[PDB]
Amino acid sequence: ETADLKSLAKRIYEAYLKNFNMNKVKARVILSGAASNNPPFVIHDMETLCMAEKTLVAKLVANGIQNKEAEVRIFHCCQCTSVETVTELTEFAKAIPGFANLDLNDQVTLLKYGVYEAIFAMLSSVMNKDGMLVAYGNGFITREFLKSLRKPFCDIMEPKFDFAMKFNALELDDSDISLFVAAIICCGDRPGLLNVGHIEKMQEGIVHVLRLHLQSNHPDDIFLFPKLLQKMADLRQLVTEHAQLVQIIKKTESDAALHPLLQEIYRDM
């Protein structure tokens, strides 16, 4: 790698560590249990959900979901985490050299279509075959408990776990993920992009740094880059399917209210 190409790697990685509260290194330490014997409170049933909620009481009441169905209460808590991640993602994007310079319209489009791809890409870091971290690493909701919920709420996460399990097998660290996320954000393939040409160029540089980083970070996984290239397509479809389900949930659920910020994201997607 060259100087110019290096500063890009370093600048993106720092933005990642700075803007995202949870990251794979902290997550693996919690899911491993090698640095502490105080594991996350496990949420595996309604009983344990209600208990965990006693701590989230202030929040739930604040948004008036205290008495909503357990699925809707969960659906909503998941939205808040999404709204929070979109906020960090926006700051992270503004940190990628060349992003802030883009027409404000293209900035919106990029975040609009990339946010969820990045979200599920990053959510894998806190997922394993039995469940996933919640509430900043303090809780652990089981994969089984999620499939126990009633339809359609139980058809939301299972597909993500399936993806995460294959993605997690790639053994990427936070240095790989930062570049990977920046790439999914600066995608010249988005619908309605004004300056596809320039953005495509920006995407090339980032993609270039990614390719070279992967080679010197994972010398034994020769085709890891193209593998990640496939993962990018998989995430695209994954999110498309996710948008579909959320659409079904909206037109068929009285209390499935959608947070505004998220609302504008799904609109026309």
Binding site: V86, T90, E91, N105, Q107, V108, E264
Partner: peptide
């Protein structure tokens, strides 16, 4: 116009 993304837009501007 694509500014039917007011909240997101504001995040892009202020923070």
């Amino acid at each position: 116009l694509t500014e039917r993304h007011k909240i997101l837009h504001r995040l892009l501007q202020e923070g």
